[PDB]
Amino acid sequence: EAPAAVVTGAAKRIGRAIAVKLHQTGYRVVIHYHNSAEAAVSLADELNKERSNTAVVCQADLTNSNVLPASCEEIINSCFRAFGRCDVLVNNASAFYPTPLVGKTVETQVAELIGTNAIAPFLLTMSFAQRQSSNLSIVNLCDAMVDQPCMAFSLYNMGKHALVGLTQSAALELAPYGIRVNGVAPGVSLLPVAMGEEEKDKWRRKVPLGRREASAEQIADAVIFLVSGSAQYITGSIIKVDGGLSLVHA
Amino acid sequence: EAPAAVVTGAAKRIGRAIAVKLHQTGYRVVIHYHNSAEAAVSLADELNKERSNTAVVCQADLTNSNVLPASCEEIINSCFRAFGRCDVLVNNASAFYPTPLVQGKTVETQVAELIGTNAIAPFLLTMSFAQRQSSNLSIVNLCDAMVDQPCMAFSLYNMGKHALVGLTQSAALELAPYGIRVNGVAPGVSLLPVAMGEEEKDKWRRKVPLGRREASAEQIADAVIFLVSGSAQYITGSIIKVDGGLSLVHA
Amino acid sequence: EAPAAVVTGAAKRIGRAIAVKLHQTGYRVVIHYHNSAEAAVSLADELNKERSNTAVVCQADLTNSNVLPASCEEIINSCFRAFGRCDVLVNNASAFYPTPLVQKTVETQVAELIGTNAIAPFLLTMSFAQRQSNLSIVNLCDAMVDQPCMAFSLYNMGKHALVGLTQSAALELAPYGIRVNGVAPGVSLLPVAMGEEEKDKWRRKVPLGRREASAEQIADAVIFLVSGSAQYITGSIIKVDGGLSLVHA
Amino acid sequence: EAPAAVVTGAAKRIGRAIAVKLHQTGYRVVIHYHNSAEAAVSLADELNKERSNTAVVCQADLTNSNVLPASCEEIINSCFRAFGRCDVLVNNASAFYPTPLVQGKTVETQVAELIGTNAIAPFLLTMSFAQRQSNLSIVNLCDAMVDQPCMAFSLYNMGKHALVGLTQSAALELAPYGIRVNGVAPGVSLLPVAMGEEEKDKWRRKVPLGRREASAEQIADAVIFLVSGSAQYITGSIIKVDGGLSLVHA
Ligand SMILES: NC(=O)c1ccc[n+]([C@@H]2O[C@H](COP(=O)([O-])OP(=O)(O)OC[C@H]3O[C@@H](n4cnc5c(N)ncnc54)[C@H](OP(=O)(O)O)[C@@H]3O)[C@@H](O)[C@H]2O)c1
Ligand SMILES: NC(=O)c1ccc[n+]([C@@H]2O[C@H](COP(=O)([O-])OP(=O)(O)OC[C@H]3O[C@@H](n4cnc5c(N)ncnc54)[C@H](OP(=O)(O)O)[C@@H]3O)[C@@H](O)[C@H]2O)c1
Ligand SMILES: NC(=O)c1ccc[n+]([C@@H]2O[C@H](COP(=O)([O-])OP(=O)(O)OC[C@H]3O[C@@H](n4cnc5c(N)ncnc54)[C@H](OP(=O)(O)O)[C@@H]3O)[C@@H](O)[C@H]2O)c1
Ligand SMILES: NC(=O)c1ccc[n+]([C@@H]2O[C@H](COP(=O)([O-])OP(=O)(O)OC[C@H]3O[C@@H](n4cnc5c(N)ncnc54)[C@H](OP(=O)(O)O)[C@@H]3O)[C@@H](O)[C@H]2O)c1
Ligand SMILES: Cc1ccc(/C=C/c2[nH]c3nc(N)nc(N)c3c2C#N)cc1
Ligand SMILES: Cc1ccc(/C=C/c2[nH]c3nc(N)nc(N)c3c2C#N)cc1
Ligand SMILES: Cc1ccc(/C=C/c2[nH]c3nc(N)nc(N)c3c2C#N)cc1
Ligand SMILES: Cc1ccc(/C=C/c2[nH]c3nc(N)nc(N)c3c2C#N)cc1
């Protein structure tokens, strides 16, 4: 019987590439999404055309609120409902936008940025663990630039920092259950859809290795390694996939 | 005239020691507190006996909620109402307790308290502090030296302290144009919990290379004093461990 | 045609496992050794029995000295001689023993511990680059460098300098398409000299399974880093430590 | 009786600023120098005119060789000869120049100088200081940009990374003797005398806090903190004095 993985924010971009590779590797997948219903349903279609009954979608808002724990339990429950098991959790979904110190209220920005990047991963990790020849693991999508952050992204960066602490704390606490917890930290990969071509090229030219951003697939490759049998002694590790960008001084 | 500092969670233990040292240094102080009114007031009275009209108290819950931003604004405003200025913010207040991943407070409450006190409140206080701005303005965040070797079953606390490092770095960068420096002090084992058996306290003490003893509140306060001083005027985004070498000790 | 890899200190233990896995992946290998000629040759014999003329041995002391640069150049040269290319360098050879601050001369200890763990890797990295596809270097680091063993200052200094080399070389060689990464074991194969009871004390500390990494688990991370699956990865040091570095005192 | 300190490479620039500040705080000082005899003597004369018999010079090459241990022992002996004690060691002396990996001194001389001055001499001076033994401490001058290094400075960077390891190893090992071991990490402070103004300004413009390099005095201030009774629980800590430079991405 095939293992099963949940990938959050899997309709588009990096999450999608992660879901596709897991699926190509033999996993059944839960394609979590928030707003991208069309693209989620379309991906599950593609995947199920390749192997019947191997992909399902699951909608949820991962903003912090008093119902977030229920929503996160339900995401994990959805994997058990579809597939009878849950072997891998990929915490990929993420809000990302500036919150300068000097439309949304600051309460909402806190809820969204810290919820998606930190609190929801924690709650999903709880629910994953609670529900548990096995290779169980969690991969959190971190950020290679968290000690050299973008200007005016304090809430986002706080979330990704918290995500590092989660990675370490959960690796430690879940090791006795045979659950490994690790990270993959892109530098610049697929640039924001809203970002102009001038800015995108400014970022590309900063990367030592190729003067280009990572493909979604290059990020996915490292996720695939961490969940694989070739990483069974690896826990609490965060693998940069940044083409050297974090090594470059101002 | 004398500069002014806000210290959160200043009624007792480390926060108290910071407030006393800042006051001894010449600062007027806002003593923020949550539940410890009697201790906050007795500290304010002691300091005002020393120098009249140099200490006030300010009560607020720093749990995450819809009203936290207003509460944090009001804390900063209280320093301005009392003293006409606000030169230093010390983010010290902190909830601390285990939140195991596997099995009275609901988890959403534990999130609100642990992430709100250790991270979100610091961020909102930082905004408000900066929004209100020979000056020497700075922020000191009380971090945790053991953040990469955490206690078992303290994920939310540890997430909170990691977020606080992120804030220290993001705010140091963003506020540097305004002359506001943002730094941290990271205790390892300082004052142990009050009811903790001495025999348990000794297990921790024995781990500390430098003297097999916890740091006093005053030793922690000394590093805060340095960071706010004229001797640290090029220092920003730095987190100073005050841990007796504890974080260098392998399992 | 098949790529080629140089593995230092490859006759035994972790370097042997790295050599074997690279060979199994289709690499031709140079098996470097200092004192372990019999073991290096027996490994070569085994690999060459699988696939003829795909493994050679190369002797060198990697202690720092006036001749270390020339010896390093010759290690790289030996790979070009045997196989006509050098795609992969694994810096694995390492001296490891205590150097207490308060009481071999100390300068010999400096030469061995800093030479093997840092200077030879730097020299080999220069020679490898000077001669220059999926090119990469993997340096064998140490997950416990920030929580070091008591009385191992020079060893620790050397492993710290190797982190610095990994990062400086990743930056500098990126224009040549040469990636430079690290693998950091915690406790893997314990020293042969170490008493059994002492070995169990280390094993007990590891969160994930209360045991040491096999040499093959270390080798697995090396394989990933040299693979096409890691082509955007440079400057990265992957811990393979079963969570040991996360455990407080 | 006044405490005594050894400052390596103290004739000029940051090491002079450190010796001066320690002197102003009440220390007697050994001003170590290599080539800068005239400057070393000029400094010692100034300090001695402020307080008679409180400064001496001490010549030594700190390049690695088989006699470097003897030279480092002698630097510590010189402090005991002059002053009867040695309370503080400041490892400031440093060679600094590029060593490109792909293409003058031989490479082995570059290793001896860059690794010697930045790491091996500090290690040997630490052994000698400890062997000879209140508020005892060592402060190592590190480099805040060691994880975002300058292009073509691998050996220098290797040396500064080794120095971080010594700071940590020695803090652990010398704690039971009450010897604290810490570091101070400038980012951009006094630029090299051969750098032209335009190039200096390129560096200065990178610094978030004031668009300017640290003064020598600012570096010295952090040293003085770490040696003081205000840091008596601090050991194994490295204080960045970089005006935020290490936080600025490419
Ligand atoms: N792209 C990069 O260069 C880069 C760099 C560093 C780190 N990373 C990290 O790698 C991961 C993937 O990056 P990416 O650029 O592919 O991400 P992205 O497109 O910015 O976000 C991925 C998905 O997150 C989901 N999401 C956002 N807000 C949500 C909410 N409130 N509730 C539920 N889901 C929500 C969205 O789902 P819907 O579309 O379904 O609404 C979105 O498609 C992220 O964790 C990111 O922080 C990326
Ligand atoms: N003690 C240590 O060994 C140690 C180690 C590492 C880091 N640190 C850090 O150093 C700081 C000081 O430590 P400590 O042991 O002195 O702290 P503490 O005694 O545990 O807490 C300090 C104060 O935090 C305030 N606080 C708690 N929850 C709050 C809430 N919901 N809203 C508002 N205020 C709240 C409390 O105020 P009231 O009493 O007025 O309710 C309390 O007195 C903390 O940031 C801590 O994390 C300490
Ligand atoms: N084992 C662990 O738990 C562990 C933990 C952390 C890091 N590591 C790192 O992982 C790598 C492999 O570890 P290991 O335990 O397999 O190593 P090892 O058995 O200690 O040493 C590997 C080889 O290093 C070579 N070597 C030693 N001194 C040399 C010199 N002066 N010149 C040339 N070669 C020399 C030896 O080759 P000859 O036998 O041919 O003389 C030896 O067989 C090392 O870099 C180590 O520092 C290992
Ligand atoms: N300046 C900066 O922006 C900066 C940035 C990062 C870190 N730092 C660190 O802070 C410290 C002080 O910086 P700096 O710029 O003042 O240093 P510096 O002027 O470059 O060098 C200081 C002294 O090192 C001594 N030295 C050099 N090679 C030597 C050898 N072979 N033997 C003995 N002594 C030797 C020289 O003494 P003589 O003149 O007597 O020959 C020189 O005056 C250094 O450790 C440095 O790496 C500085
Ligand atoms: C210096 C620097 C600092 C931070 C970054 C972060 C990149 C980044 N993180 C993201 N997270 C989400 N959810 N979506 C994204 N599109 C990104 C993104 C980019 N680009 C990139 C560079
Ligand atoms: C391995 C290890 C990990 C974390 C610690 C942190 C101790 C600590 N943090 C605290 N925060 C608050 N708000 N109050 C406290 N009493 C502590 C505390 C202790 N004791 C100490 C040791
Ligand atoms: C707390 C801690 C600190 C350092 C270590 C290092 C382990 C280690 N490094 C080695 N290097 C070489 N060349 N050979 C080895 N046998 C080891 C080794 C072990 N065991 C392990 C644990
Ligand atoms: C991105 C970056 C990386 C490294 C630096 C280090 C500057 C630096 N280090 C030095 N060491 C010695 N012995 N002398 C110096 N003059 C420097 C120096 C400068 N400038 C500055 C910036």
The amino acid at residue D22 is L
- Which of C148, C245, C249 faces B246 most closely, judged by CB atoms? C249
- Which of C151, C154, C167 faces D149 most closely, judged by CB atoms? C167
- Ligand 7 atom with the smallest distance to the CA of C9 is 13
CA distance A158 to B127: 14
Q: Is C92 in the pocket of ligand 3 (CB under 6 A)?
A: yes
Quickly count: other Cβ atoms within 10 Å of residue D35's Cβ: 10
Q: Is C187 in the pocket of ligand 3 (CB under 6 A)?
A: yes
Ligand nearest to C-alpha A186: 1
HEC readout, D146-188: CCCCCCCCHHHHHHHHHHHHHHHHHHHHHHHHCEEEEEEEECC
The total of structural domains in chain B comes to 1
Q: What are phi and psi of D79, to 5 degrees?
A: -70, -45
Q: How far is CA C193 from CA B5, C186, D199, in A?
A: 58, 18, 54
Is some CB atom of chain C closer than 8 A to the CB atom of D212?
A: no
Q: Is A220 in the pocket of ligand 1 (CB under 6 A)?
A: no
Are β-strands B138-142 and C4-7 bridged in parallel, bridged antiparallel, or unpaired? unpaired
How many angstroms separate the CA of residue D152 from the nearest CA in chain A? Answer: 12
Is some CB atom of chain D closer than 8 A to the CB atom of B214?
A: no
Residue D143 known to be catalytic: yes
Contact between C151 and C111 (Cβ < 8 Å): no
Strand partners, A186: A241
Closest chain D residue to A148, measured at CA? D247
CA distance B51 to B44: 10
Contact between A40 and A16 (Cβ < 8 Å): no
Q: How far is CA B181 from CA A34, B128, B211, C63, D209, in A?
A: 39, 15, 32, 46, 8
Give which of D169, D173, D238 to mutate to test C binding, by max C Cβ within 10 Å. D169
What is the gyration radius of the CA atoms in chain D, in angstroms? 17
- Ligand 2 atom with the smallest distance to the CA of B220 is 10
Contact between D201 and D234 (Cβ < 8 Å): no
Strand partners, B88: B5, B138
- Which of A147, A149, A250 faces D250 most closely, judged by CB atoms? A250
B179 CB neighbours in chain A (<8 A) are: none
Q: Is D150 in the pocket of ligand 8 (CB under 6 A)?
A: yes
How many angstroms separate the CA of residue C52 from the nearest CA in chain A? Answer: 28
Q: Where are the beta strands (DSSP E) in chain A?
A: 4-7, 28-33, 55-59, 88-91, 136-141, 179-186, 238-241
C158 CB neighbours in chain D (<8 A) are: 162, 165
DSSP 3-state of C4 = strand
Instruction: Report the candidate in C151, C146, C152, C184 with the shortest Cα–Cα distance to residue C166.
Output: C184
Is some CB atom of chain B closer than 8 A to the CB atom of D218?
A: yes
CA distance D73 to D76: 5
Indicate yes or no: CB of A206 within 8 angstroms of CB of D250.
Answer: yes
CA distance C223 to C217: 10
How many angstroms separate the CA of residue B216 from the nearest CA in chain A? Answer: 26
Using CB atoms within 10 A of its CB, is residue C149 exposed (0-12), middle (13-18) or buried (19+)? middle
Ligand 2, CB within 6 Å, residue ranges: B 9, 11-15, 33-36, 61-63, 92-96, 113, 117, 142, 144, 187, 189-191
Indicate yes or no: CB of C232 within 8 angstroms of CB of A243.
Answer: yes
The alpha carbon of C59 and the centre of ligand 8 are apart by a number of angstroms equal to 38
Instruction: Say how far residue B197 (Cα) sits from the centre of its chain.
Output: 25
Chains in touch with D (≥3 Cβ pairs < 8 A): A, B, C
The alpha carbon of A149 and the centre of ligand 5 are apart by a number of angstroms equal to 9
- Which of A65, A101, A107 faces B69 most closely, judged by CB atoms? A107
CA distance C188 to D164: 25
Quickly count: other Cβ atoms within 10 Å of residue A84's Cβ: 10
Q: What are phi and psi of D217, to 5 degrees?
A: -60, -40
Indicate yes or no: CB of A162 within 8 angstroms of CB of B119.
Answer: yes
Q: What are phi and psi of C218, to 5 degrees?
A: -60, -45
Contact between D136 and D179 (Cβ < 8 Å): yes
Indicate yes or no: CB of A101 within 8 angstroms of CB of B171.
Answer: yes
Q: How far is CA A186 from CA A65, A78, A183, A213, A245, in A?
A: 28, 28, 10, 9, 10
Instruction: Write out the catalytic residue numbers of B.
Output: 144, 157
CA distance B247 to B197: 23
**Given 3-state DSSP classes, what are the helix, strand and coil percentages for chain A, each rounded to the nearest 5?**
45, 15, 40
Both tokens of residue D82?
């002059």
Q: Is C243 in the pocket of ligand 7 (CB under 6 A)?
A: no
Contact between A214 and A188 (Cβ < 8 Å): yes
- Ligand 4 atom with the smallest distance to the CA of D37 is 40
CA distance A55 to A49: 10
The active-site residue out of A33, A87, A156, A242 is A156
Indicate yes or no: CB of D206 within 8 angstroms of CB of A149.
Answer: no
Instruction: Report the candidate in D210, D114, D187 with the shortest Cα–Cα distance to residue D153.
Output: D114
> Can you give the CATH number for the domain in which B57 is found?
3.40.50.720
Instruction: Report the candidate in A170, A193, A244 with the shortest Cα–Cα distance to residue A214.
Output: A244
Contact between A101 and A152 (Cβ < 8 Å): yes
Instruction: Report the candidate in A243, A155, C224 with the shortest Cα–Cα distance to residue B69.
Output: A155
Is some CB atom of chain A closer than 8 A to the CB atom of B166?
A: yes
Is some CB atom of chain B closer than 8 A to the CB atom of D214?
A: yes
Both tokens of residue D191?
């630029």
Q: Which residues in chain D have their C atom more than 2.5 Å from the N of the next written residue, marking a break after them?
A: 103, 133
Indicate yes or no: CB of D233 within 8 angstroms of CB of B244.
Answer: yes
Strand partners, C20: none
Ligand 4, CB within 6 Å, residue ranges: D 9, 11-15, 33-36, 61-63, 92-96, 113, 117, 141, 143, 186, 188-190
The active-site residue out of D33, D87, D156, D242 is D156
Indicate yes or no: CB of A180 within 8 angstroms of CB of C208.
Answer: yes
The angle formed by the CA atoms of residues D129, D130 and D136, to the nearest 5 degrees, is 80
DSSP 3-state of A190 = coil
CA distance D131 to D126: 8
Both tokens of residue D58?
């001490």
Any known ligand binding at A134?
A: no
Ligand nearest to C-alpha C62: 3
| Parent domain of D84 | 1-250
Chains in touch with A (≥3 Cβ pairs < 8 A): B, C, D
Biggest CA–CA distance in chain A, Å, is 54
Is some CB atom of chain C closer than 8 A to the CB atom of B249?
A: yes
Quickly count: other Cβ atoms within 10 Å of residue C81's Cβ: 12
The owner of tokens 């200077």 is: C119
Residue nearest ligand 7's atom 16 by CA: C191
- Ligand 6 atom with the smallest distance to the CA of B95 is 13
Strand partners, A104: none
DSSP D244: T
CA distance A81 to A59: 14
Q: What are phi and psi of A136, to 5 degrees?
A: -85, 130
DSSP B230: G
Both tokens of residue D37?
């005899």
Contact between D154 and D209 (Cβ < 8 Å): no
Indicate yes or no: CB of A209 within 8 angstroms of CB of C247.
Answer: no
Residue nearest ligand 5's atom 16 by CA: A192
- Count how many Cα atoms sit within 13 Å of the Cα of residue A245 in the half-sphere of its side chain: 29
Both tokens of residue B102?
């596997």
Indicate yes or no: CB of C248 within 8 angstroms of CB of B251.
Answer: yes
Closest chain C residue to D103, measured at CA? C130
Q: Is C96 in the pocket of ligand 3 (CB under 6 A)?
A: yes
- Ligand 8 atom with the smallest distance to the CA of D195 is 20
Contact between D10 and D33 (Cβ < 8 Å): yes
Dihedral angle sign, alpha carbons of residues D60, D64, D70, D72: positive
DSSP 3-state of B7 = strand
DSSP 3-state of D36 = coil
Dihedral angle sign, alpha carbons of residues C38, C44, C48, C53: negative
Strand partners, B33: B59
Contacts 24+ apart (CB under 8 A), B204-209: B207/B246, B207/B249, B207/C248, B207/C249, B208/B243, B208/B244, B208/B245, B208/B246, B209/B244, B209/B245, B209/B246, B209/B248, B209/B249, B209/D171, B209/D172, B209/D175, B209/D176, B209/D235
The DSSP line for A60-115 is: ---S-STTHHHHHHHHHHHHHHHHS---EEEE--------------HHHHHHHHHI
Ligand nearest to C-alpha D92: 4
Quickly count: other Cβ atoms within 10 Å of residue C146's Cβ: 18
Contact between D56 and D31 (Cβ < 8 Å): yes
How many angstroms separate the CA of residue A47 from the nearest CA in chain B? Answer: 32
The DSSP line for B164-201 is: HHHHHHHHHHHHGGGT-EEEEEEESS-SPPTT--HHHH
Instruction: Say how far residue A148 (Cα) sits from the centre of its chain.
Output: 20
The amino acid at residue B43 is L
Indicate yes or no: CB of A157 within 8 angstroms of CB of B175.
Answer: no
Q: Rounded to 10 degrees, what is the CA torsion of D50, D51, D57, D62?
A: -90
